[PDB]
Design a protein around this nucleic acid. Sequence first.
RNA 1: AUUGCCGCGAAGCUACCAUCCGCUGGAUUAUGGCUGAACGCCUCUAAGUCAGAAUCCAUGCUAGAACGCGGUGAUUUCUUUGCUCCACACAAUAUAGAUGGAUACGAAUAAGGCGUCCUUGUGGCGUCGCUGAACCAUAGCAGGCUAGCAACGGUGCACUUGGCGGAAAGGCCUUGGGUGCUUGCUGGCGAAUUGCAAUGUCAUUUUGCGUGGGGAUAAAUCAUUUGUAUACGACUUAGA
RNA 2: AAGCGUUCAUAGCGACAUUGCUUUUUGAUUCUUCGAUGUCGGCUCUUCCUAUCAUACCGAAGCAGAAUUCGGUAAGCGUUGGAUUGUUCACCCACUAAUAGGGAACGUGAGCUGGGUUUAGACCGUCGUGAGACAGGUUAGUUUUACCCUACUGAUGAAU
RNA 3: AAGCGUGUUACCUAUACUCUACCGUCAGGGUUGAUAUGAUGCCCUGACGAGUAGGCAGGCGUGGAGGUCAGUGACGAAGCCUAGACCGUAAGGUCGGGUCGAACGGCCUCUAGUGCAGAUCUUGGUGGUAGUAGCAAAUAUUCAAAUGAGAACUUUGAAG
RNA 4: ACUAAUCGAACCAUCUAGUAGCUGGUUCCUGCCGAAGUUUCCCUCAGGAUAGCAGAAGCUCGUAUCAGUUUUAUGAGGUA
RNA 5: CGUGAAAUUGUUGAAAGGGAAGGGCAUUUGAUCAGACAGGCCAGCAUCAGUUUUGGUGGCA
Lengths: 114, 386, 197
Amino acid sequence: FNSSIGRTAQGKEFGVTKARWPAKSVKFVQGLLQNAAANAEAKGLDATKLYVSHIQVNQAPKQRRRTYRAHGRINKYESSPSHIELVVTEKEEKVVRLTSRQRGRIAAQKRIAA
Amino acid sequence: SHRKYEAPRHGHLGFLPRKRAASIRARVKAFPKDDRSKPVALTSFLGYKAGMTTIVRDLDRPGSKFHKREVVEAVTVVDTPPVVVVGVVGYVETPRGLRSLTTVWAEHLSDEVKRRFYKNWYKSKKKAFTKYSAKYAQDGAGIERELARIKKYASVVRVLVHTQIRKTPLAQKKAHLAEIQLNGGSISEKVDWAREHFEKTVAVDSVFEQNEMIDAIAVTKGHGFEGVTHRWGTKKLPRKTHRGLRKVACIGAWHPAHVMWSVARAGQRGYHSRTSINHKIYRVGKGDDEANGATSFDRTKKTITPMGGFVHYGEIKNDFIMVKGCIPGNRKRIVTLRKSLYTNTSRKALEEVSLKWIDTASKFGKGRFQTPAEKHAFMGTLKKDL
Amino acid sequence: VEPVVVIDGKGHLVGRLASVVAKQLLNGQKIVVVRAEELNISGEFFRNKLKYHDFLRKATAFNKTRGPFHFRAPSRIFYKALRGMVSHKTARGKAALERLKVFEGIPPPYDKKKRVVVPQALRVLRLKPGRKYTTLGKLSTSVGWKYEDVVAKLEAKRKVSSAEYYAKKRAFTKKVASANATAAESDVAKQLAALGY
RNA sequence: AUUGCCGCGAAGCUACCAUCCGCUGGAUUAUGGCUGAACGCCUCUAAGUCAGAAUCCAUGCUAGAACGCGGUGAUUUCUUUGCUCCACACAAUAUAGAUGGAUACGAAUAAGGCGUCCUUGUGGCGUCGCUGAACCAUAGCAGGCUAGCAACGGUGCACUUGGCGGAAAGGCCUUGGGUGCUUGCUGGCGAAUUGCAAUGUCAUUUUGCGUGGGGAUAAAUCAUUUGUAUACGACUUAGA
RNA sequence: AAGCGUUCAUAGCGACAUUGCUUUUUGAUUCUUCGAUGUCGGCUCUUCCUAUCAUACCGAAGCAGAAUUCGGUAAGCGUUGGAUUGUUCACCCACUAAUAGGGAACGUGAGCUGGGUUUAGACCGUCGUGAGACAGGUUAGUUUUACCCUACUGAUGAAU
RNA sequence: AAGCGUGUUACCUAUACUCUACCGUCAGGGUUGAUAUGAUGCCCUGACGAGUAGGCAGGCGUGGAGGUCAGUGACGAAGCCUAGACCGUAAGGUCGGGUCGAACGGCCUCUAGUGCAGAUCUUGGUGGUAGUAGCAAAUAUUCAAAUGAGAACUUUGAAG
RNA sequence: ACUAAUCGAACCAUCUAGUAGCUGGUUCCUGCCGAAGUUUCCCUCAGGAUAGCAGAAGCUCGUAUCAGUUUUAUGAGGUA
RNA sequence: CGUGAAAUUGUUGAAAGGGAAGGGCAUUUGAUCAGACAGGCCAGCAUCAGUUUUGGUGGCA
Ligand SMILES: [Mg+2]
Ligand SMILES: [Mg+2]
Ligand SMILES: [Mg+2]
Ligand SMILES: [Mg+2]
Ligand SMILES: [Mg+2]
Ligand SMILES: [Mg+2]
Ligand SMILES: [Mg+2]
Ligand SMILES: [Mg+2]
Ligand SMILES: [Mg+2]
Ligand SMILES: [Mg+2]
Ligand SMILES: [Mg+2]
Ligand SMILES: [Mg+2]
Ligand SMILES: [Mg+2]
Ligand SMILES: [Mg+2]
Ligand SMILES: [Mg+2]
Ligand SMILES: [Mg+2]
Ligand SMILES: [Mg+2]
Ligand SMILES: [Mg+2]
Ligand SMILES: [Mg+2]
Ligand SMILES: [Mg+2]
Ligand SMILES: [Mg+2]
Ligand SMILES: [Mg+2]
Ligand SMILES: [Mg+2]
Ligand SMILES: [Mg+2]
Ligand SMILES: [Mg+2]
Ligand SMILES: [Mg+2]
Ligand SMILES: [Mg+2]
Ligand SMILES: [Mg+2]
Ligand SMILES: [Mg+2]
Ligand SMILES: [Mg+2]
Ligand SMILES: [Mg+2]
Ligand SMILES: [Mg+2]
Ligand SMILES: [Mg+2]
Ligand SMILES: [Mg+2]
Ligand SMILES: [Mg+2]
Ligand SMILES: [Mg+2]
Ligand SMILES: [Mg+2]
Ligand SMILES: [Mg+2]
């Protein structure tokens, strides 16, 4: 989702040119990354080996509002909320079939070089 | 139907694309034809454009109604400290074009040209050319092997020079490295000339002289995104024009159903490589020569620096070239001065210029005094203490 | 019947050599063409120069950088005649054209390799004597190829190195053909003469 | 006092309202000619060929292919022992498509090539082509074990002596010894059952991982900073 | 090619006839578009054609010079400023080397303008009993949207 | 000549021609004292097969009804999902797996508010555009403290 | 002109599913057959009726009566 | 808050991608899958039958 975004030098570490700083999105992930990491101590996991194995964002139901347009018209003004979920994990540290020719060739090969 | 009124095109189609230059040092795209009888000299020089000033001289051209009379002309002064030769490149000929076959570097490189090879000089271990400098260590046999290849092959020989930007009032600290073709002599003399000038400077008086036409090769001054009125000189639309008047009204016919490459459109203005020819040298000045600005008619012991200094550059403490008129680029900008690609005999060339006066009044205003001693004599003693 | 067939471009007619090379690549034969500057075209030089000027003037009107490209080198003029005889927009035609190398002069490693000719493309076999013809070196230079004199200096350089290769090969062919000639009238020789060898 | 107004006003920007600068070589059209037949003469034309336009192509100028290319510098351990080279070991990875050998003068084609000779020529004589249907190579458990004879060769493998090759050299020619093999000739032993055929597997590319033998011991980006730059990216500078 | 051109058809012309080309005229057709392709002119800007006004090099003349006229290659490069008119067209003034002819959806209205035509207001003349008509005159009369794709102008950029 | 004219052969390839197979249609037939018990069946023989508008025929599917299968089912009915399988030229039918939780089929007949891609269709839901156009009139805000999880925007003070 | 963003006859409900020779749409498969844009009449010319073309149902019979063909014989025609 | 379709979307996995994508005939490759030993799968050879194609050769008018 990057049409007509601005360009920055800070995208170079990822090989892109369009990159932003979604302050409000980061706080919500930081809240869930803190909650999920907190779950790992209550489960007894090792925090030094934790990594984001699965993170998933879904469209929550839209919250409706209203905007008023020229010539007495009305258009929607909706929010696009999110469902976020994430998982953090500890690091982790046959038949052959031969024709009679192939059997004989293998047998002749084993009798030709010893 | 037809235009109903003929007019010339706006803008020059041969100077396309009007895009930013690839480098801030405009490259030399042609060197003069080599005649191998003359000694080995440089075909161009590097310089920093300091600024402009005013001269007075007597015109020497019969027929003109200002013959033998004092004319006033604008000159530009370029700061030219000597270039340090630090390399040589052999160019073999090929059915695809010139091709660098090998390069040989001087055993010692100054830090001002070592900086050219670094993006982050201050953090690095400064390892550039450290192992290469061990190719002269025992007896320099490996270096002699490479120079012999350039002698055998390499029908075209170019030398590598870098500026002594330390002796310049630029904040840059980093020298400009460039290839200059070597004309005069055969291939062996050219290689021998390059080898004997390693780590040694080359003065500008050996490559240039007074009264000769030279060309400037610099990137012009950048102006950013510009509209079509000041980028192409198109007519401004009438005052009544809705939705904008600094535009091109019709950007094409219905057919072909595309915008043409030849229609004036908004875009970058300036910072283009340009090569202007036929700039006569009016003075080849010297750095350790007080009375640079004096002439045979002035005798005022004054240098070329205007009073209070060159605005946005500084003082000229090195040698300099002083060519008639304007050259592309702005002050502080690396400019390449190249000898003429043809012999000019216009009678506007071939005529000896003797300066009668050089302006040193301040360019930071309406400077009304040439020297501090002149200002002191006219104005007298002031309240400001001695 | 060779893994790479190298044709010497000299003396050949450009279209008939292009017809053979197109069908040769499409059948899976790798082909290298050398000395493309001595290729030939039927018709006088001025007539073929006019035909290139008609080709030069056709370009995309709104952007010349995207239009028909007008390649100057005689190797690329010949390559321009191979396309149009090969379905170059398909992957099979792309794989065919990968089996082609065209060169000006004779570069290494092909300088010391065997070169062949195509007798259906040779001008001396094809053209009626008295009919005029164009050489691809003059045509390409007359429309802007910059490397005629460079190739000539390197071609004459190769011919000197190759003529003195053939000098010692004549001496060695002489010695070999002498001992073989003495080997005649022997017992083994007269038996092979009955068996045809 | 929405830049209160007036005069001056640097810097910056800017004006045919200021100044400077705007190249020379070839090939051609029309046309006029030369030589010269067709047509015993004539003729710019048929074969050849001269000059020649504001033409065309170059010189020059601009961009630089973001799937064209070259040269050059440095290339990270006291850093989950990282990187690179050489060799051999195991797996995978693919294949525009090996299945004896891409086997080298140059030019001409109403001419040549090879050989020989002479007085060294644009020379004499002989020979050849009329296709590569050639030439080289080519027999051995996919090519084994062994015995001699003849000869001092042929060919391979590393090692090696010297020279040459920069257009894309990266290959070519050598030198010397060592070690194989020899089908140049004469012998002896083995092969079987893949069952009457099943590509009946023999390659060269790329990548990991391993083992043992050498070698080296960087930068770039962000962030800060400049303004020769700039919508943003980008650019151009500075910082142990 | 009958004649004109002092004589002389063809320098330059050229009757009576006859062969074409073009699609910048106007006719003729009604094939596309009436769940709309914005409509005249001008302004602005680019490019193309050559049937060349000028400029380069030429050939010819009833080419002495000068100035002209005819013709060739040639569209490389130019072809203007104004009074009146909405005008396309026209006409004159003046400069100039010259003020050539055209095309591109009669180029170009999400580029402009809106003087004209071509809504609704109003006046005149003629016609009509009248309501009203007039390719007759006059005056006033909302000119909307690009942020998408391509194209173009500039500007980054993965992979080597 | 890979051009033009003319002549000779060879060769290439249509759903066309020949032969054969299979499907269907039509036509002519065979077949009852066991038709080796389905005569709207089984089988023999020949020909034929393009199709808008349109006509007819034989079938597939849906809601409900009479009959029947003493049909299936909480040991899982219906529904839904399923680059898993099988049958049919097809409309469609059947099976496996997952999800699910209460009804639902086969066959013979009856009946109809019985099959959707369109109607600027109706109602509802959802996209690309697009994190885009924009959130620019009304001169103007700044500093500290307090509160608070959080202060450009709240409170207080100061200043403008 | 204005008469509630409605004016050359407001708005609301009903008659009213007003009529439309006109525009759009008109939902499964397979099989067999298969057109017309022409005749006459019509306030008819974007429509109908009528004949023709097409399908279906067949019926009476069983190689007839025939025939988008020719030959032979015999007419007619007023175009090239 | 029964079931919980599609449009549309997120993650994961696989695959392909030089100015659209999609499709028809055929095959390669990858992945996946049904059935069958009391003949299932793929082939080779001989002698025939039907339809063709390409030669060699003999006797006649
Ligand atoms: Mg924007
Ligand atoms: Mg609003
Ligand atoms: Mg014009
Ligand atoms: Mg200047
Ligand atoms: Mg100044
Ligand atoms: Mg195409
Ligand atoms: Mg006020
Ligand atoms: Mg003569
Ligand atoms: Mg350039
Ligand atoms: Mg590049
Ligand atoms: Mg013309
Ligand atoms: Mg128009
Ligand atoms: Mg338009
Ligand atoms: Mg408009
Ligand atoms: Mg008006
Ligand atoms: Mg023919
Ligand atoms: Mg049918
Ligand atoms: Mg139908
Ligand atoms: Mg039912
Ligand atoms: Mg169930
Ligand atoms: Mg699905
Ligand atoms: Mg329940
Ligand atoms: Mg219904
Ligand atoms: Mg629907
Ligand atoms: Mg439908
Ligand atoms: Mg709709
Ligand atoms: Mg925005
Ligand atoms: Mg405000
Ligand atoms: Mg109704
Ligand atoms: Mg109604
Ligand atoms: Mg039919
Ligand atoms: Mg109709
Ligand atoms: Mg008659
Ligand atoms: Mg009649
Ligand atoms: Mg639910
Ligand atoms: Mg879905
Ligand atoms: Mg693309
Ligand atoms: Mg048979």
